[PDB]
Amino acid sequence: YQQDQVVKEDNIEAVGKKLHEYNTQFQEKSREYDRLYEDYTRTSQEIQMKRTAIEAFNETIKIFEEQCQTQERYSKEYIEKFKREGNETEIQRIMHNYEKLKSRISEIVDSRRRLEEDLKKQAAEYREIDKRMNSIKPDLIQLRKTRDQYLMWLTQKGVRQKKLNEWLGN
Amino acid sequence: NQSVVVDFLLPTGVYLNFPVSRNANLSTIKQLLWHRAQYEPLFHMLSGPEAYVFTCINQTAEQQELEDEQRRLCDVQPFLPVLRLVAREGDRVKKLINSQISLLIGKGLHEFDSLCDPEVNDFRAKMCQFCEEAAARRQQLGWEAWLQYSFPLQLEPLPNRALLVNVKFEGSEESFTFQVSTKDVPLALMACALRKKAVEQPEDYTLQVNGRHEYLYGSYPLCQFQYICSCLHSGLTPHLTMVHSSSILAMRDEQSLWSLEQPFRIELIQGSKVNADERMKLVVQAGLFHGNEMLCKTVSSSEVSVCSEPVWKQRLEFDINICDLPRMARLCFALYAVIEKAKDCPIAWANLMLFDYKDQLKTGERCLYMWPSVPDEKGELLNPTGTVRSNPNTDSAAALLICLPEVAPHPVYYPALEKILELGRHTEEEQLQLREILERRYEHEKDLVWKLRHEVQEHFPEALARLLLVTKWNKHEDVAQMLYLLCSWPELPVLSALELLDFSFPDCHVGSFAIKSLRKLTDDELFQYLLQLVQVLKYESYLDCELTKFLLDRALANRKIGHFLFWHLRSEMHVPSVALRFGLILEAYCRGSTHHMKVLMKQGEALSKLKALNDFVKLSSQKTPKPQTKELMHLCMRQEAYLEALSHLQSPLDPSTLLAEVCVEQCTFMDSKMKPLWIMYSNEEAGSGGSVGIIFKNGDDLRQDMLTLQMIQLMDVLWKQEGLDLRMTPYGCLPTGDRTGLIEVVLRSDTIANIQLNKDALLNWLKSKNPGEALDRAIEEFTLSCAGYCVATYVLGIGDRHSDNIMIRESGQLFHIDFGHFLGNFERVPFILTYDFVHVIQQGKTNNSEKFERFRGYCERAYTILRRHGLLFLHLFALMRAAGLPELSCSKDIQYLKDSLALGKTEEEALKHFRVKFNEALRESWKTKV
Numbered sequence A: 001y002q003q004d005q006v007v008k009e010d011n012i013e014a015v016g017k018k019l020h021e022y023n024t025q026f027q028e029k030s031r032e033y034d035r036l037y038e039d040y041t042r043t044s045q046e047i048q049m050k051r052t053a054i055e056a057f058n059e060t061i062k063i064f065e066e067q068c069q070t071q072e073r074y075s076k077e078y079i080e081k082f083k084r085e086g087n088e089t090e091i092q093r094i095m096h097n098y099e100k101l102k103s104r105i106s107e108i109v110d111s112r113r114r115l116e117e118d119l120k121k122q123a124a125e126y127r128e129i130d131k132r133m134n135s136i137k138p139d140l141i142q143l144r145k146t147r148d149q150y151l152m153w154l155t156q157k158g159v160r161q162k163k164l165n166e167w168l169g170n
Numbered sequence B: 001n002q003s004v005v006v007d008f009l010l011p012t013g014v015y016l017n018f019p020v021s022r023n024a025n026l027s028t029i030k031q032l033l034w035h036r037a038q039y040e041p042l043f044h045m046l047s048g049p050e051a052y053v054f055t056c057i058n059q060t061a062e063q064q065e066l067e068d069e070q071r072r073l074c075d076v077q078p079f080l081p082v083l084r085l086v087a088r089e090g091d092r093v094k095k096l097i098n099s100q101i102s103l104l105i106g107k108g109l110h111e112f113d114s115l116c117d118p119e120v121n122d123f124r125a126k127m128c129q130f131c132e133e134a135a136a137r138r139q140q141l142g143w144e145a146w147l148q149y150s151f152p153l154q155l156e157p158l159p160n161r162a163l164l165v166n167v168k169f170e171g172s173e174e175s176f177t178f179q180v181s182t183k184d185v186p187l188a189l190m191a192c193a194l195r196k197k198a199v200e201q202p203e204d205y206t207l208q209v210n211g212r213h214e215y216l217y218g219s220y221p222l223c224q225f226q227y228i229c230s231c232l233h234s235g236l237t238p239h240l241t242m243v244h245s246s247s248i249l250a251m252r253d254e255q256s257l258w259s260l261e262q263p264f265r266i267e268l269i270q271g272s273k274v275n276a277d278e279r280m281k282l283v284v285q286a287g288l289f290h291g292n293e294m295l296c297k298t299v300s301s302s303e304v305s306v307c308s309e310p311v312w313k314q315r316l317e318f319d320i321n322i323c324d325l326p327r328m329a330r331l332c333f334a335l336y337a338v339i340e341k342a343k344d345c346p347i348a349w350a351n352l353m354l355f356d357y358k359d360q361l362k363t364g365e366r367c368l369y370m371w372p373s374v375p376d377e378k379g380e381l382l383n384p385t386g387t388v389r390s391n392p393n394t395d396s397a398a399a400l401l402i403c404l405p406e407v408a409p410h411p412v413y414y415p416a417l418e419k420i421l422e423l424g425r426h427t428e429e430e431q432l433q434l435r436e437i438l439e440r441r442y443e444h445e446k447d448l449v450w451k452l453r454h455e456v457q458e459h460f461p462e463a464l465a466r467l468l469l470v471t472k473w474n475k476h477e478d479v480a481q482m483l484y485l486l487c488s489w490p491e492l493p494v495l496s497a498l499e500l501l502d503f504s505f506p507d508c509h510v511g512s513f514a515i516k517s518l519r520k521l522t523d524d525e526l527f528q529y530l531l532q533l534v535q536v537l538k539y540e541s542y543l544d545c546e547l548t549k550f551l552l553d554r555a556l557a558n559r560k561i562g563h564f565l566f567w568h569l570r571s572e573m574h575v576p577s578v579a580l581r582f583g584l585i586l587e588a589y590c591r592g593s594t595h596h597m598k599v600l601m602k603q604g605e606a607l608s609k610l611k612a613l614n615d616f617v618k619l620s621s622q623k624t625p626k627p628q629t630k631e632l633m634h635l636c637m638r639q640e641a642y643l644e645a646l647s648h649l650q651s652p653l654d655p656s657t658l659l660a661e662v663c664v665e666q667c668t669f670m671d672s673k674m675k676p677l678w679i680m681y682s683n684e685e686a687g688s689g690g691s692v693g694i695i696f697k698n699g700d701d702l703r704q705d706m707l708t709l710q711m712i713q714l715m716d717v718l719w720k721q722e723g724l725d726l727r728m729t730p731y732g733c734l735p736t737g738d739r740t741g742l743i744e745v746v747l748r749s750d751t752i753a754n755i756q757l758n759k760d761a762l763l764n765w766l767k768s769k770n771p772g773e774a775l776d777r778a779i780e781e782f783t784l785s786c787a788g789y790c791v792a793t794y795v796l797g798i799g800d801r802h803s804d805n806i807m808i809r810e811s812g813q814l815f816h817i818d819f820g821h822f823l824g825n826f827e828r829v830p831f832i833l834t835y836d837f838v839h840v841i842q843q844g845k846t847n848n849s850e851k852f853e854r855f856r857g858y859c860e861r862a863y864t865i866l867r868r869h870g871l872l873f874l875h876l877f878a879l880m881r882a883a884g885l886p887e888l889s890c891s892k893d894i895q896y897l898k899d900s901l902a903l904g905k906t907e908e909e910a911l912k913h914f915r916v917k918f919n920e921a922l923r924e925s926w927k928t929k930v
């Protein structure tokens, strides 16, 4: 007066055939997960590297912004001193050099923006990878528990370890 | 492109932009700068070039004052090529070390600041302070103390003959050959060489094995040293050098709760960044934990439907009071994807300590950034053995939002030791039953052991582990009573202490007791278990722990320990779940070890070049044939930056070994999937051998091979400890980074396959290398080594053993390589004799009963010694489950070693079954060859 069994086939050779199939189906889905878990980990390392590179752009720009600050403060004394000296040459050389400085900050900002766009994309990939991982997990767990239920069924029935291994091992 | 366009920011706001060479050092770049600044505004205001230092944003996103100007811009690796002139200002020492720390550990110190974490800030403050103190304290003491820190004695674990020795002094061509016995103390041997003419005293001196940082000193005989012992067996003269105490100083000189009876509960607010199937609905299963076992039953949420941002707002109540939570209570979450249940996918998980690092019961909101659930054999609901540290991918990774409710107006702590010890105070058939459970050579048994817990302390002190497990940690009464006993428990031996470090015993008092018992470890024995102790840190709740303090203590007392602690920690910095913990320990290590910091920088640069040199060869193998790729490898090595970086460094594998001059012609790469580099060295200051190599591997994981090699080295030590040298070759193996590391090159050897491919070639090969009287020695080397590697491989369960992965030295010594699989994973691996090995063992005869019986004794004796130390291997293997090796992951994998050593059986029962398994291997030797 007890029930439990979930195995489909009835004959020993018929159940052992399904043991070979579900095992082959299990080992393929495991290789699929492992392939996806390599990408997950690789993308996790790539995204972190992009995020520290963005911090690098920030710290670089921050150094250029200090140079701007210093140029404005430091020029003040000399731009007046050379204008009373009638030296519009020495004034004009300072400002073009400062215009050149600011032109470089726009190059560095554009590059920071391109990486931010690439980090936005790779954050999306990471999530899609994680989604496909979580869509494969239920099958992977399904196929494991089936495989084991068939193993136990045949082991209870007395099937020797050598017959089991040739269904599994191949 | 050879040259780079570099941005220069002068301190007057002026901006130059001109090209310089990648291989140009900073000092040269500064001369080119000043020559150009000349013809730009505001030059007259500048100080001279030496007044300023260049500054860049390094690869780890921090500003670095570039104090070493004999340093190439390609070796600086600035994020973008931007150099800022700044004042040579403030404390140069603290700014320099912080920058080098960041480049050495592969993680910027600002990343620690950015967390805004008190626990991290309190760790950094305390550990850097403690480590600096020890290092400052180190520098005060004399040359005796310092040589022992720096170059500690390499000793073997018994005849009394005599042979000559080559001795000389430092900075001198003329050398002195003269006699000395094997049992002479090195104090006496120095005086003999000091008698030059008939000036100086020999107590102001030490002996150094020239061409390596190994030193012969202290109250120990000459034969117990590794160099002299190695010299005696091979038959060569020890080449040494006298060194003055002043010369050693020249090296040295560098610088309330129990009232709160309300049930424990938590508010589950929201989820974040969940990625799942839109058809299903999401569930959050949860439970409280202490170690492995539960504190109470597991609750569960309602089925809120699948989206990115699922909201619950549920009260979750647990069957346990707030007063009953132990110090190391552990709330564990698992997010699951379930079907609607009208008729199971684990998404991710996260654990949290209910109390904090200052014993405060946590209150308020927490955002637990979840780790994804990797599917495994025992598919449990929750992952209580997983780390309590939050996922450092805060931008993209999934998150659960929770709120611990307020328990009182004032903040509630966990009771201190005094109030724990206050409540802690309060012939027979019981004595026979208790002995039966513990003297083994279940809830009924647990409640017996608990009742007689004080009798366990008096009569069964080694049974503490069993008593800690039977204790009910979900009742603060029982917890209080157990800790009381632990506070006055007798000191256990190292073997038992190792067990107490396992994840089953999380309580801070148990670890503290464990570490208290581990302080008797010598540096030699501690080194044998260093790999296991490092991995136990992954089970720690908090950052400041006793094991971290212990490992740092030992790392600062001994430069060899510090070296290997460093690389064990450094090799896992790519792994998110320990990057933080390991990062901080390494920072603390460096600040107390600023001398070795220099050596480790030189290695890390070398290992950065080789990675690049491997990556080139990997691609250049697919493009062209090998002889051209070999030449294209050399051209890249000839480059000034490469050549210097690979030259003149201490070996990471053995810091006493000096890798001086790269023999670029000898250098190549082995034929394999990942194409590892065969890098050869030579040292003209060294002894008779004077030729070392390293295999740089990148692509494959080496942790498996190290564990295996670690455990054979331990067998060899255990055998040698019982007066049994099986002539094993414990070659070095060291993981250095992400799927990267080094292997020591054993010279004068080849695989058996390639000896056989070129009647029986194995015994012929040994004949050509050991002519005449030498052959009888070479077969004994083979016999002894074949014995040890047969027993080792059997006990560890290492299958796949074939001619392509077994090697033989010209001396006769046999040994194994490429330990991909162990513990029978991929069914018991049988004991394996080969016809070829038996052929050589018997001296090329049909029946050599005399010789083969000696060999059977060597296998039998080897196997018996490991059974005596069987608990040692089980305990060490139990702690390595923390490492997450695929084949060392559960009790079954540990059970393998129990069965293979026959620990359940008696001693003579083990010998009988070993002989049976021996005999069957001799039987199956004939059938395999045909």
Ligand SMILES: N#Cc1cnc(-c2cccnc2)nc1N1C[C@@H]2C[C@H]1CN2c1cccc(Cl)c1
Residues within 6 Å of the ligand: B668, B669, B670, B671, B678, B731, B743, B744, B745, B746, B747, B749, B750, B751, B817
């Ligand atoms: N295959 C293989 C092989 C793997 N591993 C080890 C090893 C392992 C631990 C320590 N020492 C050595 N030796 C190996 N042998 C291959 C031959 C003999 C020896 C090194 N030789 C070599 C040298 C340079 C380039 C190339 Cl193509 C071949």
